């Protein structure tokens, strides 16, 4: 679980979506795991702005923030789940670390704020949904 919350936008894993988010669509893009709905309150959160491909991310299977190195937002075959086929992701960043199940939705950081959203895992691996790209998140 988790969500990114910047100006009055709420992101999310789009396979975690509540009905609320969905009462509240924005934008969404199920090649990416990503949906952005809209709060009644003001959001905290910096989207970085960068190409960082080092930063922290939290792991909530370990309780932990993990150093990691990720490559670039790619398109990425990720293994049938309980959510989604067998298929290509696009904008998803992979690092070697630790991501179960419930991982999805924790923040990956770099120095310039917020990079993406545990998205995907499995095989010594976790994928990150990128948002660096989503420059209407910091504006209206
Ligand atoms: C690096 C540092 C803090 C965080 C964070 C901690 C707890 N809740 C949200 C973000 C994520 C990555
Ligand atoms: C919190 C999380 C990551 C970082 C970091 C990530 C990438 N490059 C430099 C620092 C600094 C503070
Ligand atoms: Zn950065």
């Known amino acids: 679980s988790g969500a990114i919350y910047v100006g009055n936008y709420r992101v999310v894993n789009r396979h975690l979506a509540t009905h609320n988010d969905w009462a ?3 934008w969404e893009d199920s090649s990416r ?4 709905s809209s709060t009644t309150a003001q959001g905290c ?13 939290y792991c909530s299977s370990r309780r932990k923030h993990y150093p990691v190195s990720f490559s670039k937002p790619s398109l ?7 959510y989604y086929p ?10 070697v670390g630790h991501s179960e199940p419930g991982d999805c939705g924790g923040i990956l950081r770099c120095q310039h704020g917020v990079v993406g959203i545990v ?3 499995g095989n010594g691996l976790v994928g990150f949904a990128d948002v660096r790209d989503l420059l209407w998140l910091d504006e209206e």
């Open 86 to 95: 067998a298929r290509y992701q696009s904008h998803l960043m992979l690092a």
């Open 33 to 36: 795991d990503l949906l952005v």
């Open 24 to 26: 509240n669509l924005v």
């Open 76 to 82: 990425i075959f990720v293994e049938a789940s309980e």
């Open 45 to 57: 959160d910096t989207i970085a702005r960068c190409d960082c491909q080092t930063g922290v991310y």
């Open 119 to 121: 998205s995907t895992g």
